[PDB]
Amino acid sequence: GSHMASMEMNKVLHQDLVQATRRILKLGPSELRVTDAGLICKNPNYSVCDAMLKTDTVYCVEYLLSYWESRTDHVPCFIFKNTGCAVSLCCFVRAPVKLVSPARHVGEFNVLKVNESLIVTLKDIEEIKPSAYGVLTKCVVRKSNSASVFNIELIAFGPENEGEYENLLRELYAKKGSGSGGSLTLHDLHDIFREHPELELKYLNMMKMAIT
């Protein structure tokens, strides 16, 4: 989390973030490029890991950003890059300060050319997402009709069944909110899931219904 952080603590953090990225994004075994752990929390211009995204596949980008924030205590910054025939999501502990390509922040629909950086942060997602309780923002990459271009859409998702979702939240409230009026926030979820990882699987498994 700083240039003076110990190698030992950095290695645990690096392993945590890499494993969580594979799990939360449901990546195949070869779909994550990992930067050497020796670089973490020093030069901010290097990512920790880059996820190689498939097209037409839902990715839980808001939840991943929120998880990283919970583990690092820094504001994460993920950057979509088009390497010619694939999009990578390059995951940084903190925003880089010099990028190879000109950069802009996501909206709901985006066209991603090669040698463009497309930044997504929690601040961007908060601006774009609905106000409804419990929504999570996902991203989907689509093949463009144009060569060397991909489209990236951000989509709101909710639970498949309200009642089963409510029953899961009840299990979380039995572990205990930090939100307005004692309601659970996503940061409450990360804290509970740290101690109850079986509930985290049950939660993510149900957040699969695109919202109107």
Curated annotation (Swiss-Prot):
Forms a heterohexameric complex with NEC1. Interacts with host UBA7 and RNF170; this interaction promotes UBA7 proteasomal degradation. Phosphorylated. The gene is NEC2. It comes from the Viruses. This is Nuclear egress protein 2. The chain holds residues 1 to 170 of 397 of the full protein. Plays an essential role in virion nuclear egress, the first step of virion release from infected cell. Within the host nucleus, NEC1 interacts with the newly formed capsid through the vertexes and directs it to the inner nuclear membrane by associating with NEC2. Induces the budding of the capsid at the inner nuclear membrane as well as its envelopment into the perinuclear space. Its main location: host cell. Coiled coil: none annotated.
